[PDB]
Design a protein around this ligand. Sequence first.
Ligand SMILES: [K+]
Length: 391
Amino acid sequence: TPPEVVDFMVSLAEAPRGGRVLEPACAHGPFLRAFREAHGTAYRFVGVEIDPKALDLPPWAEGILADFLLWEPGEAFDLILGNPPYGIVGEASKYPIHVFKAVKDLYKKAFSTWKGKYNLYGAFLEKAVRLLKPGGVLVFVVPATWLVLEDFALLREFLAREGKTSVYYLGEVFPQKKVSAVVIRFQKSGKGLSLWDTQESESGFTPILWAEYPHWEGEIIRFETEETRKLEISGMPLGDLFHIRFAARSPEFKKHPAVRKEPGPGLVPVLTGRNLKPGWVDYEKNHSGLWMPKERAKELRDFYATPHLVVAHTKGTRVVAAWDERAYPWREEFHLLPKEGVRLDPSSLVQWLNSEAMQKHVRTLYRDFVPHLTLRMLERLPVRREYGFHT
DNA sequence: GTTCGATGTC
DNA sequence: GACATCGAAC
Ligand SMILES: [K+]
């Protein structure tokens, strides 16, 4: 972990004299060292590490060789700090964390917050909270993705009901790692959420209070402003105007008997996010390596037969939209079908969605937490009567 | 059915 | 920086 990030986290940390201080996934124990330097020696220092090659603590700390996620210590902790591992547990061809099926089963048994594919860092957070004494403190640096994503809804709700939470946005602070990070300071007492921005100087990071949600129950966390609130009440949410569906996935296309790996007569490309631009679709260029008869597309998704609005999923945090006039097969993106009794003006709605006001709105709210516009961000986009109207 | 990325690759 | 994963996962 970069030293300025450690120093900032250590500035947020507290323990009583003689308190038990833990660094999970400790390796050589950079957090233990920095905490001792800053606060003195009258604490019980413990580090937990799975790799024998990595555990290298000073003799004033106790080292334990264990999978932190399945470790059952005798006593609870006053302070838990550090940098959990980040990564989805799954097959090596697609995912970075590789464990026996039987171990993954033990994680799922252990963690009430485990949802969908989940992530080591979520499980590390839940484990840490469970190991805290009442009034205990944890301070972790983790990806920002938990503030917004469905996979982390149980985690947000768990935190909300277990104690009080402060979130400090750092962004892309790991050199040569593609992750936007936050610090979480959790205390196992009280309630509420405090959101903080930071400014980095030579001197280190400085927290700036952004907003407080004293009655937080685990809702998505956003950077809201007076302007984002004004826009949101200006119109109907997009999700009330449209059914929002996703493209059929690559394997469905690949095994479909009408799909081909080479162009040919009557054959059309299966479109991806690279075919979608602000306000238009490139129908000619193939980016998927897949081709099919256009008329057979409805066999994968019924809505492929009907011209409709498409919104991008993987262009970062922004709103890129086009009207698919032709009704082609897509491998990617959101597909929005108007609900019963909805009147639309496709041309002007697309213009509004691609507008600078809209790009600013989403960048404000969701910064760079994830490299997507997700469904939960998309369903909340405001649409005023000129563009779309539910009668 | 659709979700997610210590992203993957240019 | 540009420009987006794409298929295991549930
Ligand atoms: K790691």
